[PDB]
Subunit: 206 residues, 4 copies
């Protein structure tokens, strides 16, 4: 849990995300909670040229390391950390099914019992705001109060978890749910869902 | 046909399943019939770290090996073995097309002559019950009486066969049928099917 | 152009077909024109264990090599060779988009100018008949009179060409056209097409 | 920035394009601005056999290197260079989602803020004309006046940029937008879009 172990795992999560087909068009950014702020991927540099030394440190005040350029979306990574004290890693991407559900400005309802991995009976969609603004950070903060992952209207997905392995796994699970949702919505609307009682049982079991 | 040969093939089926894109979100579990019970994949451990020694033995009484954690779904693997004496291997996954047909709570009708590989003119959908309960096991048992594969409502797929190679192949064939079904259902409902007479001919030929 | 050079290229076309995602559920069979009959893939043996010595020779009379089992579909490979004297290689598969168009029992109309690679302004769909029968061979023979590739109702695809490289390329092009067709048909029916005049120009240019 | 460095990068862009699944059916062609004309991929030769020496030089007058066959589409590569003086690389492909939107003869509207990477609030669709004609070149020229990428009706996609890395990235981004567009259009028409004001903000930010 030295800085370079964490910088390598960020990089492995970036490569893994591309492997899973969740980072189409190289839009992802990943961070982890570190000291008083976070370590995050940089802007510019393509994932495959990334080395430990490229990872940027952003302190609690939003001051980034000199000579480096943090991802343009660092502020909503910071907003997730302040909003969910249990989160230690955040994954952002523009996975196609999640992003298509974000364009329709729909929440994903309980069409599958794995919806409970994100903490309740849905995956919310936070309203649009221009990237990099305080207003976007505020919508992200509010959507993650009771959920570990949220869609971002006309944009993509944010998933947070206790470590990078689980944040990536969650992100992948939400992308499967989004695809399941869109494939069934084309056939029938509304899509059959599990009731609130059944999701209460599944949450108690998890 | 020693325990470790069977433990390695379980592991190869897990890797192969991921290769085929049937184990999206690492939800699969695989077992084989062994002695008086079965060998099954464990809970926890990600497929790529799996070694022969991780495979769990569950006897006929549901007593698992000490110091190991069997998959959370072991009971419906046991229910398949007791219900289909000819089955020697069971594959479970949450393949996206199968799972989307399971959400619509539809059986897959005879839209292609390969439907007969599962033993009749359809692929049933067993009703939902919370994972890991006796009630789920009962629905699985009844659906596999005359079929070798069944959808699981709001959940995924179970396929059984005489060995792991054929169980995996069947699972893959059902996922192609599910995708064929959903792609055509978007265009036209109902989807044209082969008659019962034609499926009788194909079954006699197989 | 010795038998083993041709047996290796059959095997390479099988591997390549799987690479392209056209041989989902390992249903393909490939042949080439040889001497008075053809060399074809066998039944049984999974593509990855295939060796030169597994390829079967079937003469002009339908007598296959002793000790080998030719693909169960050899007769419509023979029907293609007798029907199209210019064909020297035949590829059959159950590619998902082609097979979904075959289930709807539609021809693919001229939605893209590459439709002309198969010889006219469409890709026909031959009517269903049980696999391996003379009746299926007759429908294949008639559909390939003026086309180099045909859909097979409730079944899959047959593509023929002057060599294996081009037969595989054609098969792939028809699978792209099928997907283009189905993706657009979901939105609007009918799908806009190029006129017969325009396809005449493109054919003269090819 | 010697000829062979540029010939290798063309070849790497061809391989990369296939890796991304944008060159389905090996229809792509790539060029870069060189001296008074351009270096372009040849016709014939499959991408995997391509070597530096296969890349063709076409001067400003349309005279190609002796003993070589330039891509059949060289003229609309030349039309892009003359129409967009800032372009130094052009990518053409028949990516399936782009091509399906080109068949519907639709522009892609501002369903995602990344639409602004191509220079405005849409991705146009240039009208059909037979491949290789002056008339096609004219439609391409006019569509790229204020956009860096355009769909080509019943055909595919053209993307241009300051270097090959960015031209490929743009091409990929347009293919994600096309898929997002088609996946949402199946559910609801019209698809919700970002307003002209919001795209003005995003353009100023880029």
């Amino acid at each position: 849990m030295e800085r370079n172990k964490l910088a390598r795992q960020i990089i492995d999560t970036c490569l893994e995300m591309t492997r899973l087909g969740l980072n189409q068009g190289t839009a992802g950014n990943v961070s982890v909670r570190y000291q008083d702020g976070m370590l995050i991927t940089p802007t510019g540099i393509p994932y495959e040229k990334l080395t430990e030394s490229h990872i940027v440190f952003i302190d609690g005040n939003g001051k980034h390391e000199e000579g480096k350029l943090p991802s343009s979306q660092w502020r909503f990574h910071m907003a997730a950390y302040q909003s969910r004290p249990d989160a230690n890693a955040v994954v952002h991407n523009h996975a196609v099914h999640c992003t298509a559900v974000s364009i329709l400005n729909r929440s994903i309802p309980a069409i599958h019992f794995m919806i409970a991995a994100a903490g309740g009976n849905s995956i919310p969609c936070a309203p649009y705001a221009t990237f990099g603004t305080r207003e976007l950070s505020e919508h992200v903060a509010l959507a993650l109060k009771n959920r570990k992952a949220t869609l971002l209207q006309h944009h993509g997905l944010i998933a947070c978890e206790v470590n990078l392995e689980k944040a990536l796994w969650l992100a992948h699970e939400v992308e499967v749910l989004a695809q399941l949702y869109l494939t069934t919505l084309a056939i029938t609307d509304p899509v059959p869902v599990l009731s609130d009682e059944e999701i209460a049982v599944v949450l108690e079991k998890f």
